[PDB]
Design a protein around this ligand. Structure first.
Ligand code: CHL
Ligand code: CLA
Ligand code: CLA
Ligand code: CLA
Ligand code: CLA
Ligand code: CLA
Ligand code: CLA
Ligand code: CLA
Ligand SMILES: CC1=C[C@H](O)CC(C)(C)[C@H]1/C=C/C(C)=C/C=C/C(C)=C/C=C/C=C(C)/C=C/C=C(C)/C=C/C1=C(C)C[C@H](O)CC1(C)C
Ligand SMILES: CC1=C(/C=C/C(C)=C/C=C/C(C)=C/C=C/C=C(C)/C=C/C=C(C)/C=C/C2=C(C)CCCC2(C)C)C(C)(C)CCC1
Ligand SMILES: CCCCCCCCCCCCO[C@@H]1O[C@H](CO)[C@@H](O[C@H]2O[C@H](CO)[C@@H](O)[C@H](O)[C@H]2O)[C@H](O)[C@H]1O
Lengths: 31, 204, 184, 103, 732, 33, 80
């Protein structure tokens, strides 16, 4: 049984939040 | 800039700023109408003020026309323009003639106006209350047009029928039972958890 | 000399007895830093208060005979779908907890929204603080006991107590672990 | 008083007694010579590690020989491990089909 | 001048293009950055470690997500021997229609890549069955990555910044890592195996919504608490068990059967559960060794200071080594890399011979890819271990603080160590090459019976002692009346002896003279790579040619043409030279693994046994013979799905060759050439309207060695990966 | 696959749009005085 | 710029000064050696780092040492 469109969008949104946290860590490590 | 308020004043709708205890940016000091210190991605300035106003003003007419069309039985609003090349050219020429003066006024006055009535107001009555009401109604109108489009995408019925279905069954006819339910729930959780992360930034 | 968790031991130097519930118990030394100690004091109060509300909720739900048990109440049909429920709950609790943190940052005390402290009946006292913290600790321990009874005996708290009172030499933790194949 | 009760309780009691009466001096003087963990000639708490402060409950006990709570947990852990080793080896050797002996 | 290398004002004031390159290459050498302190260095490293952990968990989440979204995991679960596992989908707008058709495989609706990573076998073994399971795991790991990123940001904030002394508390970190990070994690994994993976192997669907309802064993936890632990070993899965179904299944959860499940050709899951449980208990016990805040436990400085032989054979012994190790991040990283890389090699050697995942042994491409992947990773890590040992000797070693201990004493006889490594390398090279060349000449002259074929009787004796009866040595596990035999006879010996005496698996393969010769080649490679690395580390502080080398640091171009000339004199250059030898060594190892297994998988062991004793046999019957399908991936007649590997094969050859340019031609040629080019641009009309900001210069001497080595290594790896995967997957 | 249009959007984004943005921004950062 | 430090084993032979192609080095009076002079490096801003001076030096080990440092237009030997 395949995944739904909503599951892919959920994963992409959680990854976008994780990427925001990553940018935050990278900027903190920089300065 | 007549869109600037007579006096700097941040209004109160359950709080002053977009979450309780939120700091305001240095460039948002309450001089603008609808100021809530809300620019977390620091996009902001005055060109974006006419951008917000223009999008809001077009959205007022959009939501008014859609609600009036749905109030009568004039079919779906999204299929309405389909119910060509000379017309496209003449409309684009007329609207571009409008936008010529709209863009020219910003180079000199810092405002847009309509043609040369840069404070376009033949009947006066302009005040800070009118400015704040205009910006808040524009924001509400463009949120309402996005709601119209999203409700027409998720359900084939018009916005009046969606309101009737929500009236009939409130807990079962809402966004959290539609196709976009789980991602909306996740966005709500992220939204409600974001300001505590921002306060962790502040206190640390 | 206040009572200590162990008789005739030296408490850590950061526990001199000013806070309510200070029995010198910090064997790991978690509260050695003062600001973290204040935050942990508020956190102990908030966890204990949520435990008191929840333990009273589980007890009242079993006392009033609500048909699904407390550990199966989420799966019940209420008409309201759980996605809408969790979204509205997160909105309301986000408002209330942002207000509570703003009050803790401004004043350093507990309280409801724009009221720090929250005491309209004016019942605040040092003995009352000791009663609050001791009932909170007892309710936290009690909630862990509720989880244990729900996990091993598959029973609510009053049901497990009645089972223990009916036969205490076979209806204890030893017997319930020995009866996991028939329970589960 | 089952076989589990007998083996676990007897091993725990024997370990606690061995730690209390027999090996207390040996453990005490070895822990005295080895001392606190160090870094660059200083204990960890003196070097600036506040989380490495010696736990105040761990020394003073009221036992006349100085047997504290940490000694009870350590020797009881040893006793439980020995008792469960005995019980497990007995369980293996009593189950038919299993024979770990080299002959 | 500029602000990009903001950690180095010396680089920021460089007016040439060297500023950009060196700004990239020195960014993670935090100790050499401007105004760094020890405490801020440790805090930056801690946060960087959080970032790396988040990257790892995101990478795993991406693999799970792409398999769940675009793979064929349920179809593979239905037929694990007849379904090619899909890695991910291909969306390439440069594809022609024949390429679209060729890459559509595995039952996919479009072009896909077939996975070689073995994640299907692993995830299926641990109990995952559906796309929903993989998706939920991927979402959980994305959240874990976000948590790690938040913790990395958090511990950089001033009130959550750990003090320097916290980082140097060795005893508490060792206690916690051994007891919790190793032991409790292994215990929790035993919980997962017992509650989920073992029932799913027996057809029982156990997930989060029903695992509190499902009994892992019919008698519950009473045998555990009573100590009647042999109950959990009763009634194992039978030899006729079908994996993932209840047919032929048992009820045991902790066993010691040994050997393999007959259908999956992999280790029994109940054996794996008992392994991880025993590991959990041993590691939790070992995590109570060191003293923290409770008055008990060992002090490592006193342990080290106590271990000095009273006869004086080791001088001062290990005195002062606690502060030497604890104050040097390079000593710690060198130890960590040496141990982890050796463990990576152990993983490679044990996963092919004792496959732990169901239907992994039958997937030949995956087994070859995993062995090669982990052995090359192990080689790079071992090179890094010795590199950071050399860096320790330059940057962190204090001779006064280590006076007379084992470190100073091994520095004091470095000539003996290096010269003996040179002797063993020379002996192995002379005699291994000589025996191979003698055999090649014997084959060329038509007389293969004149070859020198030395039987590996020592390793055959080892195989006999572990129970392989083929060689006729009757001892220990191959002697039916021995004490070692009788002790294991009721526990693990029946399954182990069934597995080790079968030639249909990879458990202790039959070996002969070809295995002898290639093992001595492997010994030559290990000893020579070690010689280069050890000579680099021990001469890092100085040699007779440059007695003050420590003053110049780990990496510097040379000391000029004086004193005879001093190219490649730095310890860094010894690392650079040793990477070539490591790649050569892992090449020999993996060539051996692949060719021997190719013969075994094709059912013709005589090809390796007869052709591997001479080097033309390797060339013709391994490289030339098995490249035929690969290089026909595209041809004038058309293309197939191996065309990506043919293209990558050539791509690797090209990158390898490009590296030779940086390695052979050196700097001053290019600098004069670039000078003429800079003249040309300034004098060319319509082009001299634009100017460079950074003055173009040739790459530096060290940078050239690095870039040439990087191209050489990348081409090496890409070429062999294409050949390995294409040759194995075109047949299997 | 579900949402099968997503590769046709994200592959040009990750392969062309993001690298162009990245090298333009990084060029502007590393040349800034 | 590169750092050129002089040590006290210098015998004042002047060979490093003669070898230098960018006039970094010069001889100054000294009392530590028989020649009554010592090499000095006052103009290391012009030092290219060729180590011709070290090749010229006769003492064992060297009495002039060049430590390559931060690179400049002058030290990179650029005419453009
Ligand atoms: C923080 C308060 C809180 C706690 C301690 C629990 C705990 C529990 N919830 Mg509940 N929930 C809680 C808040 C909420 N839940 C739910 C909605 C649900 C649902 C829909 C379900 C649960 C179930 C459960 C149980 C999961 C047992 C299990 O199998 O786990 C194994 C790991 C457990 C008793 C479920 C269940 O497992 O028991 C029937 C179940 O189906 N919860 C909502 C939405 C309004 C909550 C609001 O905050
Ligand atoms: C495991 C991966 C990893 C981790 C944990 C780090 C961690 C760090 N790096 Mg390293 N980096 C990596 C991979 C990594 N990097 C790779 C593959 C390269 C190319 C070889 C680099 C090249 C690099 C440079 C050139 C610099 C860092 C710097 C940093 C620090 C700040 C990063 C940041 O986001 O600033 C965010 C800052 C901005 C977005 C604006 C400035 C732009 C900076 C100067 C360059 C971009 C840095 C970024 C990490 C490049 C990513 C490379 C990409 C191909 C993966 C931090 C300690 C910087 C630091 O100051 O040194 C301690 C620094 O100058 N990194
Ligand atoms: C202008 C604001 C506005 C208003 C008055 C409504 C009104 C309604 N919406 Mg729409 N909507 C909006 C904006 C709005 N919407 C936007 C911006 C989107 C795109 C994200 C949508 C997308 C949407 C979907 C997909 C669905 C609805 C549905 C509904 C119904 C209420 C149940 C619900 O799901 O709550 C919506 C909850 C929200 C948080 C929407 C945002 C409302 C903003 C924040 C203003 C709130 C003001 C209010 C007084 C507080 C009702 C007819 C349901 C439906 O049509 O009938 C069954 C439904 O399935 N809305
Ligand atoms: C810190 C934790 C802790 C403490 C204080 C104890 C203390 C005790 N344990 Mg052990 N227990 C523990 C951890 C602990 N246990 C854990 C983690 C497990 C799971 C493996 C057990 C499982 C266990 C068993 C199965 C038994 C005990 C028994 C006992 C008792 C032996 C008393 C005696 O002298 O026997 C008196 C001995 C004779 C009279 C002979 C005592 C109350 C034994 C007991 O209850 O009866 C003897 C017993 O059979 N415990
Ligand atoms: C007869 C009694 C006896 C014996 C046989 C030993 C034996 C040993 N003791 Mg002593 N010891 C004794 C009595 C004894 N002890 C007594 C009564 C005490 C008082 C309690 C001690 C207290 C003591 C301490 C405190 C320590 C020892 C240690 C040692 C070890 C090293 C000693 C040494 O000097 O190495 C000399 C070694 C060298 C000079 C280096 C040789 C290096 C070779 C040449 C390298 C070869 C590499 C090879 C070529 C490459 C791989 C080969 C390839 C085939 C794989 C050794 C196992 C030490 C230790 O190791 O403990 C585990 C240690 O710390 N002992
Ligand atoms: C856990 C693993 C680990 C960690 C934390 C480090 C950390 C470090 N290394 Mg060691 N190292 C490792 C594994 C590791 N390395 C491995 C596997 C090798 C073998 C390849 C090495 C070989 C090595 C050498 C030879 C050197 C370092 C250097 C460094 C430092 C700067 C790295 C840098 O800026 O590169 C920047 C990297 C790039 C810009 C990319 C290079 C091209 C890639 C391959 C593509 C930093 C302390 C340097 C040092 O400490 O100077 C004294 C140095 O010279 N490392
Ligand atoms: C096929 C390529 C090749 C060969 C044969 C060698 C050979 C050798 N390497 Mg060199 N290496 C290579 C590639 C090679 N290397 C590359 C690409 C690099 C990267 C730059 C290195 C970097 C390197 C380092 C850094 C070191 C070596 C060392 C060694 C020696 C290893 C010990 C040994 O095997 O002794 C046996 C010797 C040989 C196999 C050489 C050939 C002997 C011939 C066949 C003898 C017979 C000659 C014949 C009769 C004469 C006829 C002449 C005719 C005109 C009459 C050996 C001399 C190590 C060393 O010197 O240890 C002592 C050392 O430290 N290598
Ligand atoms: C992941 C990266 C990626 C992607 C998605 C593409 C996609 C494409 N490439 Mg390939 N390319 C890439 C990387 C990529 N390229 C790299 C790294 C190289 C060098 C190795 C090449 C070398 C290459 C060549 C030599 C050619 C392509 C061509 C094409 C097109 C073939 C399909 C077609 O028939 O279009 C037909 C073309 C059209 C229908 C017109 C498309 C016009 C686009 C949409 C204009 C977009 C505006 C532009 C991107 C503005 C940039 C702004 C800012 C982001 C910088 C397609 C647009 C072929 C071509 O057609 O492109 C010109 C072509 O000749 N590529
Ligand atoms: C201090 C010290 C210090 C040192 O140093 C160290 C150490 C030792 C670590 C420490 C100790 C400690 C302690 C033990 C802690 C623990 C805790 C817990 C118990 C809490 C909770 C807490 C808990 C709480 C929150 C809670 C509760 C919950 C609630 C809300 C809910 C409920 C319920 C309801 C009603 C009903 C339904 O039907 C269901 C539910 C929904 C389910
Ligand atoms: C006071 C007093 C006394 C005493 C007595 C008592 C009271 C005692 C008790 C004590 C005890 C009674 C103790 C105990 C302890 C125990 C412990 C502490 C345990 C632990 C355990 C463990 C650690 C386990 C583990 C494990 C597991 C879990 C699983 C399996 C494996 C093993 C076994 C390892 C006398 C009379 C002398 C005198 C007078 C007074
Ligand atoms: C397994 C063995 C079990 C033995 C344990 C049970 C016996 C002991 C239980 C009696 C405990 C009485 O606990 C007692 O609590 C009171 C408050 O409640 C503490 O009293 C403290 O707070 C009160 C209340 O503000 C103030 O008067 C004052 O600051 C201080 O005395 C005592 O310091 C403690 O001794």
């Amino acid at each position: 049984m395949p995944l739904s469109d909503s599951q892919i969008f959920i994963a992409l949104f959680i990854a976008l939040l994780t990427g925001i946290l990553a940018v935050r860590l990278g900027l903190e490590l920089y300065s | 800039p007549s869109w600037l308020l007579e006096k700097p004043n941040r209004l109160w709708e359950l709080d002053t700023t977009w979450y309780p205890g939120a700091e305001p940016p240095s460039y948002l000091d309450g001089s603008l109408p609808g100021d809530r210190g809300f620019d977390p991605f620091r996009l902001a300035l005055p060109w974006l003020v006419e951008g917000e106003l223009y999008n809001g003003r077009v959205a007022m007419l959009a939501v008014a026309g859609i609600l009036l069309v749905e109030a009568a039985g004039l079919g779906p609003w999204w299929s309405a323009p389909f119910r060509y090349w000379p017309g496209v050219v003449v409309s684009h020429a007329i609207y571009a003639a409008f936008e010529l003066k709209r863009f020219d006024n910003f180079q000199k006055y810092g405002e847009t106006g309509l043609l040369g009535f840069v404070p376009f107001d033949p009947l006066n009555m302009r005040d800070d209350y009118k400015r704040q009401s205009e910006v808040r109604n524009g924001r509400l109108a463009m949120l309402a047009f996005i709601g119209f489009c999203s409700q027409a995408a998720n359900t084939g019925k018009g916005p009046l029928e969606n309101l009737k279905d929500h009236i009939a069954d409130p807990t079962h006819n809402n966004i959290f039972s539609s196709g976009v339910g789980t991602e909306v729930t996740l966005a709500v959780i992220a939204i409600t958890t974001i300001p505590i992360v921002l306060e962790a930034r502040k206190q640390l | 000399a206040r009572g200590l968790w162990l008789p005739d031991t030296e408490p850590p130097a950061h526990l001199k007895g000013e806070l309510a519930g200070d029995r010198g118990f910090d064997p790991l030394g978690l509260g050695s830093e003062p600001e973290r100690l204040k935050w942990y004091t508020e956190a102990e109060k908030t966890n204990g208060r949520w435990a008191m509300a929840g333990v009273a909720g589980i007890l009242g739900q079993e006392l009033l005979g609500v048909q699904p048990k407390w550990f199966e109440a989420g799966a019940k049909d209420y008409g309201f779908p759980p996605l809408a429920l969790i979204s509205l709950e997160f909105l309301l609790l986000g408002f209330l907890e942002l207000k509570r943190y703003q009050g803790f940052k401004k004043t350093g005390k507990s309280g409801f929204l724009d009221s720090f402290p929250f005491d309209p009946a004016n019942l605040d006292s040092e003995a009352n603080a000791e009663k609050e913290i001791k009932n909170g600790r007892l309710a936290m321990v009690a909630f862990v006991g509720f989880v244990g009874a729900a996990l091993v005996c598959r029973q609510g708290p009053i049901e497990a107590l009645q089972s223990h009172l009916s036969d205490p030499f076979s209806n204890n933790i030893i017997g319930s672990i020995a009866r996991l194949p028939e329970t589960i | 008083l089952s076989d589990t009760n007998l083996v676990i309780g007897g091993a725990t009691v024997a370990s606690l007694a061995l730690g209390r009466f027999v090996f207390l001096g040996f453990q005490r003087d070895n822990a005295k010579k080895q001392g606190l963990p160090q870094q660059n000639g200083q204990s960890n708490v003196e070097a600036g590690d506040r989380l490495a402060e010696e736990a105040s409950f761990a020394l003073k006990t009221n036992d006349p020989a100085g047997f504290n709570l940490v000694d009870v947990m350590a020797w009881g852990a040893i006793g439980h491990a020995l008792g469960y080793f005995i019980l497990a080896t007995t369980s293996l050797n009593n189950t038919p089909g299993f024979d770990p002996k080299p002959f | 001048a500029t602000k990009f290398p903001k950690f180095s004002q010396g680089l920021a004031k460089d007016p040439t293009t060297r500023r950009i390159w060196y700004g990239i290459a020195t960014a993670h050498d935090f100790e050499s950055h401007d105004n760094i302190t020890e405490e801020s260095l440790y805090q930056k490293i801690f946060a960087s470690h959080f970032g790396q952990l988040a990257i790892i968990f995101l990478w795993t989440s991406g693999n799970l997500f792409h398999v769940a979204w675009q793979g064929n995991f349920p179809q593979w679960v239905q037929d694990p021997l007849h379904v090619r596992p899909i890695a991910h989908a291909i969306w390439d707008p440069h594809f022609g229609q024949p390429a679209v058709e060729a890459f559509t495989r595995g039952g996919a609706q479009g072009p896909v890549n077939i996975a070689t990573s073995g994640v299907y076998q692993w995830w299926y073994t641990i109990g995952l069955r559906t796309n929903q399971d993989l998706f939920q795991g991927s979402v959980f790991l994305t959240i874990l990555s976000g948590l790690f990123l938040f913790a990395g940001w958090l511990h950089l904030q001033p009130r959550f910044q750990p003090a320097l002394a916290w980082f140097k508390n060795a005893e508490s970190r060792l206690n916690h890592h051994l007891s919790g990070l190793f032991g409790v994690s292994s215990l929790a994994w035993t919980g997962h195996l017992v509650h989920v993976a073992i029932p799913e192997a027996r057809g029982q669907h156990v997930r989060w919504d029903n695992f509190l309802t499902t009994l892992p064993h019919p008698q519950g936890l009473a045998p555990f608490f009573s100590g009647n632990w042999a109950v959990y070993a009763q009634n194992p899965d039978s030899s006729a068990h079908l994996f993932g179904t209840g047919e032929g299944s048992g009820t045991a959860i902790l066993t010691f059967l040994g050997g393999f499940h007959p259908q999956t050709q992999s280790l029994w899951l109940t054996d794996i559960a008992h392994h991880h449980l025993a590991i959990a208990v041993v590691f939790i016990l070992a995590g109570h060794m060191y003293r923290t805040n409770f008055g008990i436990g060992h002090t490592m400085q006193e342990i080290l200071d106590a271990h000095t032989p009273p006869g004086g054979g080791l001088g001062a012994g290990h005195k002062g080594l606690f502060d030497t190790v604890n104050n040097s991040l390079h000593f710690q990283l060198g130890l960590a890399l040496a141990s982890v890389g050796t463990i990576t090699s152990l993983v490679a050697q044990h996963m092919y011979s004792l496959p732990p995942y169901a239907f992994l042994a039958q997937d030949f491409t995956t087994q070859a890819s995993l062995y090669t992947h982990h052995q090359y990773i192990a080689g790079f890590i071992l090179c890094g271990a010795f590199a950071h040992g050399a860096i320790f000797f330059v940057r962190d070693y204090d001779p006064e603080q280590n006076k007379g201990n084992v470190l100073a004493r091994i520095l004091d006889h470095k000539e003996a160590v290096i010269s003996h490594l040179s002797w063993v390398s020379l002996f192995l090279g002379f005699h291994t090459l000589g025996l191979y060349v003698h055999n090649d000449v014997m084959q060329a002259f038509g007389t293969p019976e004149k070859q020198i074929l030395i039987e590996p009787v020592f390793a055959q004796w080892i195989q006999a002692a572990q129970g392989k009866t083929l060689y006729g040595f009757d001892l220990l596990l191959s002697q039916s009346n021995s004490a070692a035999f009788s002790a294991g006879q009721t526990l693990w010996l029946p399954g182990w002896l069934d597995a080790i005496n079968s030639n249909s698996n990879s458990l202790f393969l039959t070996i002969g003279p070809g295995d002898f010769l290639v093992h001595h080649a492997i010994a030559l490679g290990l000893h020579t790579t070690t010689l280069i690395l050890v000579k680099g580390a021990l001469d890092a502080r100085g040699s007779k040619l440059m007695p003050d080398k420590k003053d110049f640091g780990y990496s510097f171009p040379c000391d000029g043409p004086g004193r005879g000339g001093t190219c490649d004199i730095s310890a860094w250059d010894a690392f650079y030279l040793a990477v070539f030898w490591m790649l050569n060594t892992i090449g020999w190892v993996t060539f051996y693994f692949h060719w021997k297994h190719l013969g075994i998988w094709q059912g013709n062991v005589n090809q390796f046994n007869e052709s591997s004793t001479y080097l033309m046999g390797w060339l013709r019957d391994y490289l030339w013979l098995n490249s035929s399908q690969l290089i026909n991936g595209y041809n004038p007649f058309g293309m197939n799905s191996l065309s990506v590997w043919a293209w990558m094969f050539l791509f690797g050859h090209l990158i390898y060759a490009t590296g030779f340019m940086f390695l052979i031609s050196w700097r001053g040629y290019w600098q004069e050439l670039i000078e003429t080019l800079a003249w040309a641009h300034e004098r060319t009309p319509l082009a001299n309207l634009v100017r460079w900001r950074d003055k173009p210069v040739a790459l530096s001497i060290v940078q050239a060695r690095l870039v040439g080595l990087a191209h050489f290594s990348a081409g090496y790896i890409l070429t062999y990966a294409a050949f390995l995967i294409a040759s194995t997957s075109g047949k299997f | 696959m579900a949402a099968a249009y997503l590769p046709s959007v994200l592959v040009p984004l990750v392969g062309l749009v993001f690298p162009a943005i990245a090298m333009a921004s990084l060029f502007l950062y590393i040349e800034k005085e | 710029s590169h750092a050129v430090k002089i040590y006290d084993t210098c015998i004042g032979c002047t060979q490093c000064v003669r070898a230098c192609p960018t006039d970094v080095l010069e001889m100054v009076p000294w009392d530590g050696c028989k020649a009554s002079q010592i090499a000095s490096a006052p103009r290391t801003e012009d030092c290219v780092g060729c180590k011709r001076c070290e090749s010229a030096c006769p003492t064992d080990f060297l009495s002039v040492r060049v430590y390559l440092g931060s690179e400049t237009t002058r030290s990179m030997g650029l005419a453009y």
